[PDB]
Write a protein that binds this ligand. Structure first.
Ligand code: NA
Ligand code: NA
Lengths: 212, 213
């Protein structure tokens, strides 16, 4: 069973952050064999900590590790922009078996937090004339680069047919993403409205669209 | 702190060949002819595939082969089959009585054919126009691999100002999706006769056109 980590955390340059990683008494709690890895996208992982608290040669002392019960912790002090990466824990579940955490993305805040602009598009006429009814929810100009998207039909949940893209930085150094909802024309015309609800930093924006 | 470095995961198509790498040091992989390879399916006991770099036990298919060069060892799986989907681990002697193991590689077996993108061009929405904005969205979906080139036109003429295109991301069907949006004022939108989104993917081109109404 995988080890449990928070999906993300953020801090300002110079701050201290802490990442926790929770397992069971058969792995994290059974041995002092917890290791921490830093991975930038596309690069091989770098070992930061091994055996709970030991640093390999050449690893900065800004990184420290500890453990209490079935939870191991990685602390990063003096947060620097180069520390923006994915961090995952690893632990022995036995002599040869290892279990891995799900990874925590560390965001180093390089600009003010920005709530997203949300623009919802009904199906185009070309689309409906072709018996398609895809809706697109454009989400732009937000920071940091994480949002939660939920669709609705007449104020009821809709989970099937939804695809949301991973946020990516645009030219204004803010993040953009889109979510689209594949619908048949019958679904589109049988409801009074469809809604795209976008949540960012606990704040929620909902846009609504209706057949015409 | 020692471990043999393996890529976390690779993937290949049925029938093709893949090669896993296993990087050690001059004191283990590079020092001896004693690299082994194991295959493990979830919840099952590991199976020795290769020992002493390239020797194959009886009962192991000859589709598995091992080699090494310098401080890096390699396992090759020819004629990839669905049953080959598993975790693969390398190990090497670090000395007479010591051994180092690898971090493991998940081998996923999945057909991933090329696919040209579906392109849907959206004109400005009503609420957007009443807020004095007229963004156009070009939805680009269901393509593989994850690289496209988007070009916008107005009146058949190239337009690069005010366009943003998201980095393509893999969707639930293992194909990629992205969107390109063009930021206009309502006045710009109405002052043109035509707007077009042209998507290029592997020597294939799709152009969609929309006009104000
Ligand atoms: Na113009
Ligand atoms: Na045009």
């Amino acid at each position: 069973s995988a080890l449990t980590q928070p999906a993300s955390v953020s801090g300002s340059p110079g701050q201290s952050i802490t990442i926790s990683c929770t397992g069971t008494s058969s792995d994290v709690g059974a041995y002092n064999l917890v290791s921490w890895y830093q991975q930038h996208p596309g690069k091989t992982p770098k070992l930061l900590i091994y055996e709970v608290s030991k640093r390999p040669s050449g690893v900065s002392n800004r990184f420290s590790g500890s453990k209490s019960g079935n939870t191991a912790s990685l602390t990063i002090s003096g947060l620097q922009p180069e520390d923006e990466a994915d961090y995952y824990c690893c632990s022995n579940a036995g002599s040869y078996t290892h279990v891995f955490g799900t990874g925590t993305k560390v965001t180093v805040l390089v600009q003010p937090k920005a709530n997203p602009t949300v623009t919802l598009f009904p199906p185009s006429s070309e689309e409906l004339q072709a018996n398609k009814a895809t809706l697109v929810c454009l989400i732009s100009d937000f920071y940091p680069g994480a949002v939660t998207v939920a669709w609705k039909a007449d104020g009821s949940p809709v989970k099937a047919g939804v695809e949301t893209t991973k946020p990516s930085k645009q030219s204004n150094n803010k993040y953009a993403a889109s979510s689209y909802l594949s619908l048949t024309p019958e679904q589109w015309k049988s409801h009074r409205s469809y809604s795209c609800q976008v949540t960012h930093e606990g704040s929620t924006v909902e846009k609504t669209v209706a057949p015409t």
